[PDB]
Each structure stands twice: as structure tokens, then as C-alpha cells.
Amino acid sequence: IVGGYTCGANTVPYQVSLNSGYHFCGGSLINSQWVVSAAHCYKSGIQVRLGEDNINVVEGNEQFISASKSIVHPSYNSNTLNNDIMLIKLKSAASLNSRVASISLPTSCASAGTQCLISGWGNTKSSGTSYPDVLKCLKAPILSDSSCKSAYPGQITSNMFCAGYLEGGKDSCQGDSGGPVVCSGKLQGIVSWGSGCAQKNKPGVYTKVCNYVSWIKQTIASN
Numbered sequence: 001i002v003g004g005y006t007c008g009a010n011t012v013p014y015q016v017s018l019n020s021g022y023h024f025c026g027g028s029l030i031n032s033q034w035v036v037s038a039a040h041c042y043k044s045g046i047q048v049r050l051g052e053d054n055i056n057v058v059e060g061n062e063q064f065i066s067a068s069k070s071i072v073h074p075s076y077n078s079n080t081l082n083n084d085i086m087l088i089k090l091k092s093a094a095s096l097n098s099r100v101a102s103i104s105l106p107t108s109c110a111s112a113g114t115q116c117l118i119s120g121w122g123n124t125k126s127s128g129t130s131y132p133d134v135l136k137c138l139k140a141p142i143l144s145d146s147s148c149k150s151a152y153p154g155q156i157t158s159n160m161f162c163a164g165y166l167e168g169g170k171d172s173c174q175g176d177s178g179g180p181v182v183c184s185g186k187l188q189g190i191v192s193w194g195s196g197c198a199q200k201n202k203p204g205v206y207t208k209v210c211n212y213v214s215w216i217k218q219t220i221a222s223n
């Protein structure tokens, strides 16, 4: 996250870290056994880390649970990042408490202008490299589809939305991939892509979760 703030320990209790020997992506806990992330974050051998604030220090609230299965969206296109969504099932159920809690799926798509909370452990610079150890947060509005399509001509599908600041300076970034965009207390987006981070006229692009609710519900009911 570039230009954000320190969330504070366990104020984003649905945020997870995906670990393959190192943190590589975020995700969101949607119930005690399932996490949503980006398909572009797929790898074999994922450990899900819940209740994290400082990813480099054990502070005592964490739960580390291996993934049993990963399910990439059946229409994911790695070239265009269309349908950039994946489900991860945990080998055992998380213990839900005040520090580890699930986030609701949307029944409805969020509106342009809605302020959303984006979080993660990604890069904090638009130029250069500085990774934080503690969870960062950013509030950012959803942009109109026309401003989104203007920013990324020919690249925005109906399964994507833009959120951020056209002036630049504030954005998600590498390492935040997979993480939540929460608006009005529901998971509305997944950190997906953008051109650089925090660049002028290049806002963040997010998977539009409301288009996937039927697939998520069907998949969890059968796996």
C-alpha cells in the first residue's frame, strides 16, 4: 500500500497472508474454512496465516493453517487478468474470535464514489522498494466505469473496477495482490493489477467480487 496508514493490530480481522516460505499475497477469510484471493496468486504449497499484524514476529494471536485445495476460477485468463479470483480451502477450520473473523460477501455491487478499505503488506513506495512488516490500510473511492476505461483503454472488462486517486500518490501495490477491498462492510474487490503503483491516471484495478458470488457459494457447498 502506497500512501496509506498503519491499520492497527487486528482491526482488519478478515485479512490473511499467503505464505510459501515468505509472504507473497493477501487474501480474505469468508468463513471458517475458506479464503478468497486472486488467481494470479496461485501456487502449490500455500500456508494461510490469520490474525497477523507484524508478519515477521509471532505476537500470539496468529493461526497458521495449510491449504488443502485451491480452486482457480474456471475462466481465469492470466494474460488479461479477467476473472482474477481463486478460492483456498483450509485443512482445518479457523477459530473465529475478535482478531480473526470472516467478511461477508456482497448481495449487491458497490456504487461509484463509495469509499472502500484496501489493506495489505505490499510495497509502500511508487518508486523503489520498501516492504512493511505491519498491515497497512488505505481508504479509496470506487471510480466511475468511464474514468476506469479511460485510464486503461481496451483492458477493463465487466469483471473489473477501478478504485483510487487519478492524481496518484495513494494505491495498492505489489504484495497487496489477492487482498481485500471492503466497502460498506462487504467484500467488493480483490487487489488485482494496475500500471505501476500510485501513478497519475493509473488507478488500481480490482476483481469485481459481486459477479462471482454464485460461483463461490456453489463451490463451497460442494468442496
Ligand SMILES: [Ca+2]
Binding pocket: 052, 053, 054, 055, 056, 057, 058, 059, 060, 062
Ligand atoms: Ca505475526
